[PDB]
A paper describes a structure:
To identify the neutralization sites on the HPV6 capsid, we first prepared the HPV6 PsV alone according to our previous protocol followed by vitrificaton and subsequent cryo-EM structure reconstruction. The PsV displayed as homogeneous particles in the view of low-dose cryo-EM images. We finally resolved the structure at a resolution of 5.5 Å, as determined by the gold-standard Fourier shell correlation (FSC), with a cutoff threshold of 0.143. Like previous overall structures of HPV particles, the HPV6 capsid displayed a T = 7d icosahedral structure, with a diameter of 58 nm, and the capsomers exhibited a pronounced star-shaped morphology. Twelve of the pentamers lie on the icosahedral 5-fold axes (pentavalent capsomers), while the other 60 pentamers are positioned at the pseudo 6-fold axes (hexavalent capsomers). The pentamer of HPV6 was easily identifiable, and “suspended bridges” (comprising the C-terminal arm of L1 proteins) connecting neighboring pentamers were conspicuous in the density map. In the structure, the HPV6L1 monomer exihibited well-resolved α-helix and β-sheet core regions and interpretable loop regions. Overall, the asymmetric unit of the HPV6 model had a very similar core region to that of HPV16, with a root mean square deviation [RMSD] of 1.95 Å for all C-α atoms of L1. However, there were prominent differences in the surface loops and suspended bridges in the structural alignment, believed to be associated with genotype specificity. Cryo-EM structures of the HPV6 pseudovirus (PsV) and its immune complexes revealed three distinct binding modalities – full-occupation-bound to capsid, top-center-bound-, and top-rim-bound to pentamers – and illustrated a structural atlas for three classes of antibody-bound footprints that are located at center-distal ring, center, and center-proximal ring of pentamer surface for 5D3, 17D5, and 15F7, respectively.
Residue numbers in the entry:
A (entry chain E): 26 to 468
B (entry chain D): 24 to 468
C (entry chain F): 201 to 290
Write the structure that this text describes.
Amino acid sequence: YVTRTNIFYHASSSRLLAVGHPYFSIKRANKTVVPKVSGYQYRVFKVVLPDPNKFALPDSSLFDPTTQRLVWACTGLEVGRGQPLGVGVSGHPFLNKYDDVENSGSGGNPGQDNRVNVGMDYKQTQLCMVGCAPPLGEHWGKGKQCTNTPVQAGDCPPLELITSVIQDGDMVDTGFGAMNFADLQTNKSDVPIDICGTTCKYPDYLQMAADPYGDRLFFFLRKEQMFARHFFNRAGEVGEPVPDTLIIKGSGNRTSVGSSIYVNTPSGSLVSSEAQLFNKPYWLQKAQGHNNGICWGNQLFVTVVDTTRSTNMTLCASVTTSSTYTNSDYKEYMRHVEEYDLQFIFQLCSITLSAEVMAYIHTMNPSVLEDWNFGLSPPPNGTLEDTYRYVQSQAITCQKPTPEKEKPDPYKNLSFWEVNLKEKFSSELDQYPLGRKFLLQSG
Amino acid sequence: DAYVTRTNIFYHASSSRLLAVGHPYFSIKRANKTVVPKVSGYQYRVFKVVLPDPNKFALPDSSLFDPTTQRLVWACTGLEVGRGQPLGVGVSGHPFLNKYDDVENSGSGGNPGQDNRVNVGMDYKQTQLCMVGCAPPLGEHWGKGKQCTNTPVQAGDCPPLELITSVIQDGDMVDTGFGAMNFADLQTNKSDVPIDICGTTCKYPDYLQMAADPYGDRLFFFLRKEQMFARHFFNRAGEVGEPVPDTLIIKGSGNRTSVGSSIYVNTPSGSLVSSEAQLFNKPYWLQKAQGHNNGICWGNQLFVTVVDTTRSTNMTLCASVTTSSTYTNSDYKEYMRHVEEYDLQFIFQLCSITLSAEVMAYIHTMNPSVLEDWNFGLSPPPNGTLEDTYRYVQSQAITCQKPTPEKEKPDPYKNLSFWEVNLKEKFSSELDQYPLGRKFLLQSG
Amino acid sequence: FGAMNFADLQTNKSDVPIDICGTTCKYPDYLQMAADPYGDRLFFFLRKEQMFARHFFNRAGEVGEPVPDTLIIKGSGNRTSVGSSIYVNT
């Protein structure tokens, strides 16, 4: 039903800032000096693009400027990523830990504060997600216990699966679960320090496969490998005693209980250069969903998260410039670099205009009708109803801080990294490389 | 399969979600009942699919088929496992293990027993599999205790073994490769294996036994992937039992007149995940099956078994019964659960049958107990036939117990238990606005 | 380890091996070469690299900036001492 056009463009930025501290965000209450800039953080970008009915087109002899609209059609998609390779690492300098359970006979008596410096690697991961609708991240928090008996602190609760949109800055889980280590962990010491202040996420694809619009997902790959290195313990008491059915009470020191909690050790394998999905161009020559290149609002969502170039930088600075070697010479400083760019090739679609397909987009999305004009008057939404909002000689209806004002813009508290490229088009494409790579593909 | 006609009717089904969490190692409960059962990654996954009768739905045309002759049924086309968790393995062990010491890097030799039980946690082997069929599958493990019995038994003899072909119930742990055998029976130490394996039974499927009956009620799809490597080596602690023959060894004096370890124990291990090596969310298409059964839910009913190790993570959270204090090791008490996620995405084809005598003979061959659900099976001579003379011997207070013949066999497996799912309700004609029903067009072309 | 003038950024001259103590490592990009519309610096390229992590090590000296007092739970007595969160990949 769409009108496939004839002319293709391209835009790209030149660079994208991401440099600074991997471990955490040091920020004064007056001002921020550097955010937590880490490789493991989710990297979501949104470009803003212009509108093709806004940009005047001189070769418009195909279509009449009243009976038709115009929308872009994203065709060629390409991820720019150009840093040197290398693994990063984090940890916790104070970890609840008895010993290696693998080669040890029994454990000592838990006294006070066996929290020591252990610093651990993470997994391989590379991914991509492209659309004109934001993606959903699925995480958990503690389920509220139901009021049958009063609970004491120190309990196992159940757990609610929480759907949320994905921000920037939050990190991916490393097989430790999309769970609130803010809420569920309560000691601030059991998981590493990079994540202990927050929670981690993961995208659920099957509910993401459950949309009729197609505008949220049409193209997606993944790699993500991992193995487990070691087996250690926690340090503390156990809220659940293991039963005496399948165990035997011993004698002597064996009557003193050993560790029941075991912890794993997530760990990365060898890296690969060849297996990277970066800088291989992709095209929706055919769609898998309901978005046949029809991105809306001149808006794009991209999220690509990587662990491969994750190396964090070491740098020191002298304090006294001493001659004979001391330990009081150099104060430490830790940063970590990231660098990306985005490269995209497009098409157009001139929309045939009736009220039926004007009723189509409302059945897809009602928000962008605010600028999709057609004549603003005859969407006749009005039908018969009693009254909710429009009878105000007030007397029962009141002071109302919340009810209708915080809801209509959903993404304002969604804090994520942004990109503004509303002028970077290109008519001819022999002067741009990846379109020339397309030019042999088109022939 | 050449007696039915492949129709043109194709629908879609969908289960939305299946939330399931629980403690990994054992089940927590009071004395009464379980609200929080033992859930972990390595339990076998027995399920039941339930489909409604196709004749009771108003199919769009009534002329191409005839209900007075035949009673059509669903037929399967292509299904897949929609696994949905972040990838990761969670491990366990047993806090009191039977062991001398390590044999690999033998620093010094041991002397047996004296109760030095060992806390060692280790990983497992890896599996991935999928298995379907209109009848639930049959697994195996080993048994103990019976012989031809000519000789008496002393304290602690050697028993022979016995293979137990048995059904898989859900919650049964899949083995780490040790042995499909009753650990409650053969492992009397109650200490030697990890904690969820100490009392229960691990089992395993026999695929050639699935290849035995040539119908195919237990198999028409069969895909697999497993990997394996063992890291280091152990002993046990105890007594030798059967001694090694010294007829080829040469003994020695000093401390070496004493016996060393003869019992030698592996420590198996797992390799990394390979996310391209999985088999989930890839649409599977079989135009030609492997048994006589070309994908028919005989019973309007199916059985799927798929066990994961990739998303086998354990999960922790810390909690202090204390309000706040200066930090000791006596502050927090710990709790463990284990997340799970499974969903099913289901495409079928309505298939017509025809009624003939050898047809209704063959249903009595296949499962004779099922035609009573069908309606056009009527016996014109009576089966009750007034042998009891239609219940009038005298009924001398028979009324109280007259109803004790109610009805028998309403379930073939009453004591068998497993988790399942209702699917009487999730159907639609045009699957195109559903996911993967557009991928129906790809394979068809 | 990084694309830097290391002897500038490290005044210790002892936190890296020898051939990077007073030198400066570089690494070729692709994209600026991809950006040029002439290609006198690019017409055919390829690469292959493998790496994994052996160990984790530390550095000793003046401490850095710790967390803002809440993600730490303060140790007791001997455990009051806090050290190198400098996490050395290998």
